[PDB]
Design a binder for this molecule. Structure first.
Ligand SMILES: [O-]
Ligand SMILES: [O-]
Lengths: 733, 734
């Protein structure tokens, strides 16, 4: 019954489906998302151009104005929506996970399932509805993704906290991103965590054993449970969860305290009535609710009766104005465990001052309150030291919060060249994976011709090695947070240069050779200078062009110059460790895990490269024809003409005279035996054989194996190659 | 456990998904299938042009050669793959359901999940693999879809049965079609039918009560259970299932007997070993099986050990040659209930001649055998009569089978204009929804302009009625079997002219007016003559152009002339009754039911029109702005400028000063109240309000509600309108 509707529809996809019958079969769904035809703006819409015509200052003025314009259907606390909007922006950005690069605010996914209906996003449907008139006014020139985050940024500034600035540039998306692994639990918070803790309920011991790559302690939360681990009001244990979850989001102790203390300077929580008065979340609500949810049946369901988290906490005596009241209260008050009106665990200063304002009655006041997760910051040795320091030096908190908030909002925006608008901060931050300005003058087509010829006749280089090295550098790209790719030549830097998947001894030889080509050019062409990054890509691109020529297809393989070389200082080894692949199908590297088969990892990577199923397929077949395995092995190299760009991989894979059988106990190695001669002809991996097994992939393999499609194979390969090589080229108009 | 993998992947979409949390929510998946980017051949690939250059006669010669080239990994019965190939083609075409027009061979879906792994398609994985070398040889110039069916047709002809011919033209598809309702059961045959019989197990009584629109008696079967209903070997009850299932596939008694007796002239069934020796179906098999499944562990798992259905029946004494041996055996033997080697029910003539050949030993023979489903044909009064007649007059069987086989293979290919190749049958058949040749010279641009002006100045025609009538005509199109659309002007004929969803009183007046425009033009413009079909579409098109102009936008609204007018004799009432909508979101007609909500019907219809979510959304919004409801109501007409092409529907739908509340008990009617003034402002349906509720549809509604997107709205509406009006224009070169 979980995951099943009581009524079984017989239209619009209703009925038992293929994935119901064979739920373990590989699915290509993630390669069919975000298709141009599904984008109502058109596949060629240029968001950056639209945003640059925007009257940016006017937009912020209108956002600031709205914050104190209370709407009767959801009245503003203290006459100011600032706190609500800060929470909106924080939750949009706060799903980010540094290791796999998923979540974050960069696609505006809060407006779709499942995030629109996660328990932790309760009543943010109201927040999004409040800013819709600004979206309506400025139309396509500001995206929902940008607007949600800008609104929080403007809210901070119009409550007295000056930020570092802001960058736009997040293009909207148009369907739910069903590629994200949020977890395998079949419940939400307050449950939703048996799997991610492997059934452990030892809250201290389990804290640092949260399932990778997850960054929240329950399904449906942003980071942690405000009532403590599994609702246990133990601040010390909560601190361990906080460190774990924020750490998984790429934040350290100082950033973590800064974000929590900075954030909870503002607004309040809502727990005025018990949960049984609350209707279905937006995805489960009736048509009349028109995209909203959590309808509250008590009174008008809003204002004094607001119910969001079940807690009723006001952190400071001025919830609409920046202060040091959070840390002053946290440290100077004595705290007692009490119940909120909705029955949740929170803390109160029962003998403290009665001067915390009521959000709808200026004559009424309350005592100081805190969450268990707030008390965490003084019930951990390291957090306590930071809290103590900043109590005395609030300007240090302000500095750290400005920096951490900027990071939170922009971590997944990608390279600096993507950041739009007139107040992009000038400081270059390590988490932006920064790139320098170019050296010298840009190479032209004559220089490219000369360089191709040199590269293809240089000691230590050949077609196989060049193609492999270029693809290895390219596939670090991931579209979720726009990290990685060939720009920067980071394969030449730590940690990539010593990744086992890069065959470091071969790689050093390849890079030394390309550096020699670079030195020869840069010492002798006036002010023209070429980057190693461009040479890596140009080398692989020249290799592909020659391989095509050798296969009997004359094609001009495009090349876009202008990449620059990152420094090691700009390339944090821990940050880049997150891009290291477990397996890579393009170069026949690696093995799957207990939770993910080799071919599943390949489809996941393909989705991160924005590839369609035909693009994935053509690239694998071509890489095999080129002999481009990471180790130079013959696994999957089903051709007698290694280095020629033929569709032999496909032709031989589907040759029924070859019988395929398991060799390794682990399911990863396969042998292809000629059924006539009974001799072993080939060795294959799961990345190879999936193309002859999965019915949709095999349909594509057949196309390339068909007589007459040799030129088509080359044209398609070259298109896909170009696309992959240029994924990070946001510097190009 | 059902529908859940034991290992929970954390890659490639692994993890709990939105549809798991909210499984009753409307899904737009069916509007995101078959997108050009997913097609390895490219969006601009023209299969018709590729097929035109095909060496068709050479393909048939190669298929014929293959039939007797036995491959050691799947040895041919009697040294001839003919029977297997006929079954392959029959199963490819045999999933068709007349009521919704889904299934059939026209998309080549047998090669994808779920059809590649249905129990009834066991070992057709081998059949498809056998023909791959021909596909490899001819490349893009013949589709898998055409090849599977052509192979069956060529197999018949080489085994001595001359067919009527064949038409190509089925472009391949590239992903599983997850829009088809094959049933709600969570099991396959031998189970897979509790839902479709509403838990009835009375096999004779329930036979005519099969859940609509289904056309098989268990999930995973083509039509019926060869062992009898629920595996009960009763031929009389089997006959009632056969009538029901084939009737649901658009075949009558004569056609049914012809196909069954015609098909079972050839080959044999396979039931040599117990099912326990058979491994996973293709979608569940390991990588080494390379797309095949049902691996049989006895011996080499093939030849004498073949196990497909569990039955071991050879119908005739010459299974590789056309004969009347099937009806002779059926009627002239006495039958006793026996068990096959796999333990399944079948029938044998235990006193009969021992002269039915063994498939791998030319010296060994067996007695005659039949399936329970074969005995059905002499255990029903009507079938028995046809059977006895054709025993005596096998030439009548031959004629009926040629016609029924041609129909089976081509029923979902659409208009005759789509049929390709050198042996397209010359006879025009009713199930092809035939159209006449055009009358007169084709109207030109100047004529079109003159006709638009005449239409718009004709009493009784206005923008709302013209747009409504054109869309009512167009949305009969369904891409699954390529039926319906504006060509033919069938809205003027029975049954469409009487559809309550077409507002027959109003429609009659609109058509009379268009007929006046036609009369005035035809005979006053030399040899140029215009059809009523073109006038209906041109009228709507003129209306849209006028509505745009009245909204301040001068836009070309393209028009493609050349439609013809069908006759009533070319327009079958039964066939066309299957296109009658129960709800229509474009014109705010009708409603859904428990199992198909109003908005679900709309999305299903959109899928059949090949619409994307933005295209569906823009069309609904524009129809409302035009006041184009079927009955001229104001339901959903959220505009003070009805008849002007504006995005008002969206603007007003998302206006937070309007509060929406249910008016009726069934959740189909909604009232929109101005929160300040407290007055009722609007009435809305579920088709209206879903665009402000569903998060993905609302995201699109917002685009068209945004200040600055007015011109974009008009451009997108006109593009979508043009698309829908032209869906059936296979006569025009792409
Ligand atoms: O929060
Ligand atoms: O069959």
């Amino acid at each position: 019954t979980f995951g099943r509707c009581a009524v079984k529809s017989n239209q619009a996809g209703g009925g038992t489906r293929s994935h119901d019958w064979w739920p373990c079969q590989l699915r290509l769904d993630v390669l069919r998302q975000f298709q141009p035809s599904q984008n109502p703006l058109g596949g060629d819409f240029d968001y950056a151009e639209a945003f640059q015509s925007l009257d940016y200052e006017a937009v912020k003025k209108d956002i600031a104005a709205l914050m104190t314009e209370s709407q009767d259907w959801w009245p503003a606390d203290f006459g100011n929506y600032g706190g609500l909007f800060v929470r909106m922006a924080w939750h949009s950005a706060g799903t980010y996970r540094a290791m796999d690069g998923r979540g974050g605010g960069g696609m505006g996914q809060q407006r779709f399932a499942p995030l629109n209906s996660w328990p932790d996003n309760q009543n943010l449907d109201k927040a999004r509805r409040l800013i819709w008139p600004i979206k309506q006014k400025y139309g396509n020139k500001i995206s929902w993704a940008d607007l949600m985050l800008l609104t929080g940024n403007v809210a901070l500034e119009n409550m007295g906290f000056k930020t570092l600035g802001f960058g736009g540039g997040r293009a909207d998306t148009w369907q739910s991103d069903e590629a994200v692994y949020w977890g395998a639990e079949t419940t939400f918070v307050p449950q939703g965590n048996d799997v991610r803790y492997n059934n452990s309920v030892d809250i201290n011991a389990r804290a640092d054993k949260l399932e990778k790559p997850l960054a929240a302690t329950h399904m449906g939360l942003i980071y942690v449970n405000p009532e403590g681990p599994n609702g246990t009001p133990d601040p010390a244990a909560s601190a361990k969860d906080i460190r774990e979850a924020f750490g998984r989001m790429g934040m350290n102790d100082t950033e973590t305290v800064a974000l929590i203390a900075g954030g909870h300077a503002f607004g309040k929580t809502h727990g005025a009535v018990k949960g049984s008065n609350i209707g279905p979340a937006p995805e489960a609500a009736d048509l009349g609710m028109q995209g909203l949810g959590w309808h509250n049946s008590v009174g008008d369901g809003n204002g004094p009766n607001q119910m969001t988290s079940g807690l009723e906490v006001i952190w400071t005596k001025t919830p609409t104005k920046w202060s040091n009241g959070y840390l002053e209260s946290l440290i100077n008050n004595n705290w007692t465990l009490v119940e909120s009106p909705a029955g949740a665990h929170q803390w109160e200063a029962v003998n403290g001052t009665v001067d915390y304002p009521d959000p709808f009655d200026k004559t009424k006041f309350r005592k100081a309150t805190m969450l268990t997760s707030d008390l965490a910051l003084i019930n951990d040795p390291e957090y306590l030291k930071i809290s103590q320091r900043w109590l005395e030096h609030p300007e240090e908190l302000a500095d750290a919060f400005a920096k951490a908030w900027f990071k939170l909002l922009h971590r997944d925006l990608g390279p600096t060249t993507r950041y739009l608008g007139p107040e992009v901060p000038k400081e270059s931050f390590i988490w932006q994976d920064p790139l320098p300005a170019r050296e010298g003058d840009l190479i032209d087509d004559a220089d490219v011709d000369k360089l191709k010829a040199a590269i293809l006749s240089t000691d230590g280089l050949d077609v196989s090695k060049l193609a492999s090295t270029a693809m290895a550098c390219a596939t670090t790209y991931r579209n979720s947070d726009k990290r990685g790719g060939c720009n920067g030549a980071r394969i030449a830097l730590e940690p990539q240069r010593n990744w086992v998947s890069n065959n470091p001894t071969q790689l050093s030889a390849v890079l030394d050779a390309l550096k020699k080509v670079q030195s020869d050019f840069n010492g002798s062409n006036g002010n023209k200078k070429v980057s190693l990054a461009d040479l890596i890509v140009l080398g692989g691109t020249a290799a592909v062009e020659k391989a095509a020529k050798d296969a009997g297809v004359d094609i001009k393989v495009p090349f876009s110059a202008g990449r620059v070389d990152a420094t090691q200082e700009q390339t944090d080894v821990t940050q880049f460790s997150y891009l290291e692949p477990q397996a890579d199908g393009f170069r026949n590297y690696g093995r799957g895990t207990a939770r993910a088969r080799t071919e599943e990892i390949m489809v996941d990577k393909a989705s991160q490269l924005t590839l369609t199923p035909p693009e994935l397929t053509v690239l694998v077949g071509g890489m095999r024809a080129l002999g481009a395995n990471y180790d130079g092995s013959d696994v999957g190299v089903f051709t007698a003409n290694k280095g020629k760009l033929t569709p032999d991989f496909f032709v031989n894979l589907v040759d029924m005279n070859i019988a395929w059988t398991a060799s390794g106990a682990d399911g990863e190695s396969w042998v292809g035996t000629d059924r006539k001669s009974r001799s072993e002809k080939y060795k294959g991996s799961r990345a190879d054989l999936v193309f002859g097994s999965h019915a949709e992939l095999r349909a594509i393999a057949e196309v390339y194996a068909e007589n007459g499609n040799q030129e088509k194979f080359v044209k398609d390969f070259v298109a896909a190659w170009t696309k992959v090589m240029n994924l990070d080229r946001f510097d190009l108009k």
